[PDB]
Design a protein around this ligand. Structure first.
Ligand SMILES: COc1ccc(S(=O)(=O)N(C[C@H]2CCC(=O)N2)C[C@@H](O)[C@H](Cc2ccccc2)NC(=O)O[C@@H]2C[C@@H]3CCO[C@@H]3C2)cc1
Ligand SMILES: [Cl-]
Ligand SMILES: [Cl-]
Ligand code: NA
Lengths: 99, 99
């Protein structure tokens, strides 16, 4: 698709068999989702957003559908106002910005 | 142009007579610029993201040149770690997300 930006670019994602809403976020390096359970081991990571740095759980090689496109990659779990799909997975689904 | 997302989507902007680098950010509702002087009236605002909220100054009807495209709109000024072009100005240059 071609998504305009008059509204927030929210899409449906599927992770762990559950549907969630997430924001396509070209200003995010990383994908950050709200607390949920994911399989496997996690590693620590600190990310710095607009208000400061927070700790998150980094899970690698997680299967995630984004707007109907399959991605497999790193998901950070921690307190974010909204689930955000960052460039690590936007690249996997072939997204570009155009103007 | 078509901008891929392997790297941060940074562009040159001109605002207040000043050249700056800024992120094209589909996850940002509003445009947020690091501390600088702008003319006219302003009002305080709080904006929030990962890590919490910061206090900013809201300036209305500010012209920004974004990668050579002129736009006008509200610009927030405050202690953001990065300059952010948000959806309120991305729409005006006709930016879309494509995949
Ligand atoms: C109302 O207007 C705005 C409100 C908030 C922001 S924001 O900068 O907090 N942010 C909002 C996003 C994230 C939460 C949400 O609902 N939408 C814009 C983001 O693109 C932000 C833009 C950003 C803010 C601060 C630093 C770098 C980028 N990136 C970001 O938080 O990425 C996180 C932090 C890590 C650094 C970059 O990637 C890592 C993942 C911008 C304008
Ligand atoms: Cl505006
Ligand atoms: Cl349009
Ligand atoms: Na003004």
């Amino acid at each position: 698709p071609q998504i305009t930006l008059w509204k927030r670019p929210l899409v449906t994602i599927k992770i762990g068999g559950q549907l969630k809403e997430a924001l396509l976020d070209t200003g995010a390096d990383d994908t950050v989702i709200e607390e949920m359970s994911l399989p496997g081991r996690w590693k620590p990571k600190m990310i710095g957003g607009i208000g400061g740095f927070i700790k998150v759980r980094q899970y690698d090689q997680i299967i995630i559908e984004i707007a109907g496109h399959k991605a497999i990659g790193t998901v950070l779990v921690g307190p974010t106002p909204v689930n955000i799909i960052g460039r690590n997975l936007l690249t996997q689904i072939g997204a570009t910005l155009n103007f």
